[PDB]
Design a protein around this ligand. Sequence first.
Ligand SMILES: [Zn+2]
Ligand SMILES: [Zn+2]
Ligand SMILES: [Zn+2]
Lengths: 171, 194, 179, 58, 371, 117, 66, 67, 151
Amino acid sequence: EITPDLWQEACWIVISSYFDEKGLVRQQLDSFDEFIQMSVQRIVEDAPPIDLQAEAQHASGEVEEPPRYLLKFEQIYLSKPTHWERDGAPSPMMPNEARLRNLTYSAPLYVDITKTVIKEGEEQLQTQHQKTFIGKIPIMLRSTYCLLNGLTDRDLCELNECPLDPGGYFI
Amino acid sequence: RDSQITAIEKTFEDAQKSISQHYSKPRVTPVEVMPVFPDFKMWINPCAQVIFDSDPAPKDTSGAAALEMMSQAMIRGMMDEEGNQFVAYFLPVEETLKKRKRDQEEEMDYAPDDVYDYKIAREYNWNVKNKASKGYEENYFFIFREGDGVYYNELETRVRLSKRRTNALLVVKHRDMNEKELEAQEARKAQLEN
Amino acid sequence: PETRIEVEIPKVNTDLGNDLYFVKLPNFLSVEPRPFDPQYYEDEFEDEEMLDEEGRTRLKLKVENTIRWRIRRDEEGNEIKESNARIVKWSDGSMSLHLGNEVFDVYKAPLQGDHNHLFIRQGTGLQGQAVFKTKLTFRPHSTDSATHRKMTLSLADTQKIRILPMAGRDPECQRTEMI
Amino acid sequence: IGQRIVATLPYIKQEVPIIIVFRALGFVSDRDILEHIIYDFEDPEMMEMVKPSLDEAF
Amino acid sequence: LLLAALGRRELDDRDHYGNKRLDLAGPLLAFLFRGMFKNLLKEVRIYAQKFIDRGKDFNLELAIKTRIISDGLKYSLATGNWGDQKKAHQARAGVSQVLNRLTFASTLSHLRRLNSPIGRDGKLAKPRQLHNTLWGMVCPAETPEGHAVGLVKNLALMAYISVGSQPSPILEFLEEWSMENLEEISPAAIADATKIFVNGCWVGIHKDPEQLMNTLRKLRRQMDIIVSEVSMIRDIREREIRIYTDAGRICRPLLIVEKQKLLLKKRHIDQLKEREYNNYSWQDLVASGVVEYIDTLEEETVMLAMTPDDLQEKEVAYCSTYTHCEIHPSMILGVCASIIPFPDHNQSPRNTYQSAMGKQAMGVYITNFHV
Amino acid sequence: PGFVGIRFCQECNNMLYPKEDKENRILLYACRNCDYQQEADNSCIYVNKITHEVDELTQIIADVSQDPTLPRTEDHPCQKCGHKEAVFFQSHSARAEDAMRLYYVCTAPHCGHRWTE
Amino acid sequence: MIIPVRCFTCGKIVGNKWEAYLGLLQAEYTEGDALDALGLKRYCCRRMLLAHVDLIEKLLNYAPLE
Amino acid sequence: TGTLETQFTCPFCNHEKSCDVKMDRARNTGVISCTVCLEEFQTPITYLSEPVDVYSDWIDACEAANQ
Amino acid sequence: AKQDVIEVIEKAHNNELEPTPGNTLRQTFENQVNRILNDARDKTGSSAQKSLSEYNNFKSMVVSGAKGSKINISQVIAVVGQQNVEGKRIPFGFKHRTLPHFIKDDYGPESRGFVENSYLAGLTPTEFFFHAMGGREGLIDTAVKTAETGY
Ligand SMILES: [Zn+2]
Ligand SMILES: [Zn+2]
Ligand SMILES: [Zn+2]
């Protein structure tokens, strides 16, 4: 067991291991990482699915059964933060570039939408638009969806970024 | 597909390379290198992990006596006053400890004319999770045999025991395995090929 | 009064070796008890799906971190059992698991509090075999590897988001479908 | 005569006596309602306090 | 309510941190995104309606107005107004602030800042007072000395905020232990039996709370069913067991004490000292069940030593039943408050003023400052 | 004086109210719904302790003996079973709290004796 | 960022001693014996090498805007 | 959520806020009368009964009678 | 002084403490303890005053009246004293105790905020936090008073 004599060393060894595992901004990163991994998916599928029924125009002179539309948002995909030049050429957007060019460091969000339509008494044939794009979500630096994740000191300095920067903020 | 086979074969080939120095702390050197294999001897026996809510050792016996008794303990399903089943934990009596040691020293599995007595110690409510229950995860145990290798085996059943709320002695006589038990071993052996 | 209950059961004899260790495999380690043979090999139809990199990460671990053994015949036809993994004991008493080129630290921890016992199932009863004294936990060495970064996802293993490979025209994809 | 208990339910423009809320949930008899509140009937001190609410919802 | 009216149970305290949760960047963004996404489906509804009432086919790729999420998120993160721009004057302001890049300690402390939604200019002192419940969770010294004094707080060095996990694994484990489902039990049985609450949902009653608590703690200490964030509080006088798995619970790590002895023995320190060669780390310390994350609501029932080497020997026994031990009592300070040398030799307002000025002191604020 | 409590109707299980038997001049308990009624055994309709003297000891529970954050004394042996270890604490109930009186519970299972000195 | 040329308090040149001090510390010298070896007697001069942090080594990790 | 209604649209002549409720707490009866078409309805009330309960009894009697 | 407070606590726990006029029993107990601890702090400070040499620079700055008071000398040298919030000793923020480090129903000096160390000797962590709680009141009053008095 740890004697009183050694306890002052042991105490700071335990603390140092805590701060090596968890940075100082771990609560931020974790929160955001869990939002992207869970809360966005959950929010989409928990939304009420669209039910549209056309306004009866009565042009046949009778009470018609107007067609109704069904859409269900399904799986969510999120790519890394990307910058497209004005011509659409794709490039990974470096945080530092964003910081200099006044960009917003965000990732595009895509969602599978299965469309379905029920015309009066006739059959419905669900068609689907895979990975349609919904807006961009801003990414918090140094999270798992960031580009600076698990990157070594050589890499960070190569990206003109600071290895000591805690991350945990949005651009 | 073969992009995977080629990589797998590489891991065996890399495993054939002799080791001579530690991957860090350079003054250290390898004392023993052991291949890891499924325990071809033990895989036929369905090993189960029993987790007690509290120390099951009998209060008056400490140290080696407690370990030897518990290592030979037997657990059996019992039926209560209303007929609902529970679990009885039995420990070997002192003669059984002596007999087991005698037969082991005589290299016999059991003496064919002897009966081994175990006394009930406690009643426990039991919760059984096995491979057949949804979301069951496999725990393993590793046996290190010096100069032979490290052989691992699977804990097919996980039993969690909690203190429940008849002073009975379980008298055990050994018998040969029947065809159904042998078939169960062969079926387990089959998990190693085809 | 001592109540006599008589039962007939075969005795299970166990060779517990020198040390018995409890092992809970982390998500980044797995074990295949069948011998690795490319013939009749597992129909690992993961790449058939053309999975994204959360899945190719899973596939990488599936190939690289599985402890496997195989039967190989020498020129005499003798069947030799070979393992792609091996545990090394060091002069300082530490241990590490070497799997081909992968290396993992192995930490020995005594099981305090948990009264975990090894029993063998026999019919409707259980025969005691041993008390687990130490458990082994494994961690990858070579933290400089990107796989170390990615292994965090294996720990995280309800639908979850998927990650696209940054591909596409998207401002133009917006604009073009918009036409 | 005093100490009536009222619940402010969401979307309900007025306070409702809790005993009415329990009857609305389907627990019609006063014994059954009190069983969900006064776990130990051996407690006259606590029961004397619910009487005003049982009275209001009579 | 009856208990409180009879006075058998004390009233609840709004400033006790066991009764508080922190909305971090995750639940904050989920709160926006929920609104925007619901708006996005409002627009797909009105757009498709315009097309389908005419009998034509509405193309959803045109119906999705991409901009609603993109500019929605962006807007509130840019201005700090946490709500739809159409109704900006009704939503919270300053939730998102420009990171303070004047000095590294200001950057670090700004990333570790807590805010109380209490309206400023409020005469009430209680919400601004340093409640005892903040010990080790929130820095007792780092708070602005202006009008925001005590409302704006900062995390202690080892304060962790739970990210949250689903309770289903726990519920399954409870159902397999001897817990009566609330729907099955006879009301008469609730009298002499503890009431178990999971995330505030009363889910059952249990006859033997002592074995249950010992089991639940053993699980958490092995990281299997119960993740280490979960906090089990045993209200003995109340006969209630409350298990929380939700997000936002502020908690901190503590050493475990089973008898008058730490669970942290020299073997752990030795392995920890070598963590460069072998990757032994904090995770192994937690997994070996030597350390534990205690939450404020759980801390009301733990008996905590400050230092083992003096408060576990005795002359005339003071406690003799400690359950946890502080790692190091200086971990109660925050980022700016822990750079102060000898803060325990200073008057506390001086410590507070140094915490405030430590964010205004010049230095190299980041290594890539030339970029 | 005692402390009067609720009485329930055997037919509908609703609460019974006191009624004087206008004829037999005795006390009856009667259901406001069904015509059920029964003869009262107490003759006391209500009581109200103004002093609020309450035997605070009765609300103490034996489970408190295992609280780790509660002080312990070997100096006050259990009056019932003689066990030395006892936990002691004050009556934190608004009317009892003013008195600062101590209450002791035996730290021995299945004894559970609670007393005051 | 870079070792100061002169001790702020007295003026002794200490800009030529950071590399030497690093070399002495590369040997097993205790920083107090290192400081004595470098001839820093007054505490004002010793404060310069004990408290100096060489950030220019970090700033050099970045590729230059040649 | 909000304040409870005290004036109602006569379910017959549909004139808005034309109906008011007189509550005879003594005879345990509520009386509602359209100040436009003079239609009236009366229902037994209790001490819990509010104007909204009388109006409802009127609507329930109308909805039951118009079948 | 600590022994005297302990004796008062024993008398209170045994109900040997008679409630003084106007006050309740719990209030008379708090008054008794505050009296004992105030006597302790004042006496230790006074003993500190007479021990200071004529060249002591605290005394030179206190007897001149330029800056400081004898209470500051007392707190720096002898003992800091009782830490109060809203005029009362530190409240039971947790259930019936001031910090998880103390045992339930502990009305002793260090359990309720009495800082027994001096600023030279340093403050124990529990009474460090209690000193922070006491000093927070000054900051809050400073922030809220300005808006009431300016109006
Ligand atoms: Zn009735
Ligand atoms: Zn006793
Ligand atoms: Zn100098």
